[PDB]
């Protein structure tokens with residue numbers, strides 16, 4: 220009886236195995252755009268993905284992860300609210316059963332159809348496992364998805380999903396360029412938070428871009444054909460794998476833009 224997104228093991232149950240679920244800096248949150256304060260001392264984000272080396276795509280039973288070689292400074296996030304260099308290790312998405320829900324963060328209570336998370340770890344801690352034990356260990360770049368025009372740079376991801384339908388399946392996934400998933404503007408909100416799945420560790424500087432990307436209805440429909448279950452188990456569609464907004468508590472969301 221492990222955690223998931225069903226009626227009996229979903230987000231409202233997670234605190235029983237992971238008491239930090241009720242902690243002081245949990246994610247996601249609602250971004251109230253009128254209360255977020257412009258911080259002119261924030262620097263522009265630096266997204267340096269030209270040398271990124273993707274390796275594999277994995278259905279882990281909760282989402283699918285596109286994994287990268289993080290044994291060198293190849294794809295890094297710097298600047299913005301960050302001190303130091305954060306290396307890209309994986310990206311994944313959260314999405315809904317319907318276009319009206321799916322994102323984890325919300326904007327003035329608006330839910331997007333999906334949300335992309337590009338996960339990076341602070342190189343001063345040496346590896347990801349040590350980084351998640353630190354309050355400034357991770358930087359997650361969050362990007363909202365709305366349904367409209369197709370995102371051409373997403374299609375290579377969509378087309379491999381048939382090969383990783385069920386939990387525990389992986390496939391080679393080399394030469395994928397995550398620059399094709401970015402919007403035009405890098406304007407962002409930022410706040411201190413957590414992993415949005417167990418173990419819910421309070422180790423993330425969240426950087427959420429204001430500009431969503433557009434994906435097509437056909438692209439998101441293919442996300443919804445994935446399975447939470449393993450092969451040869453009863454089919455449960457991988458949909459609504461999002462945690463709802465958590466209390467902001469004693470935190471301020473800062474904006475990079477006026």
Ligand SMILES: NS(=O)(=O)c1ccc(NC(=O)Cn2ccc(=O)[nH]c2=O)cc1
Nearest residue numbers: 286308309336338347359413414415416
């Ligand atoms: N929704 S989230 O807050 O961004 C969030 C982000 C990351 C995690 N955990 C990991 O990444 C662990 N890990 C590490 C290397 C890897 O290759 N694959 C992988 O899974 C959990 C939640």
Ligand SMILES: [Zn+2]
Nearest residue numbers: 311313336415
């Ligand atoms: Zn995530």
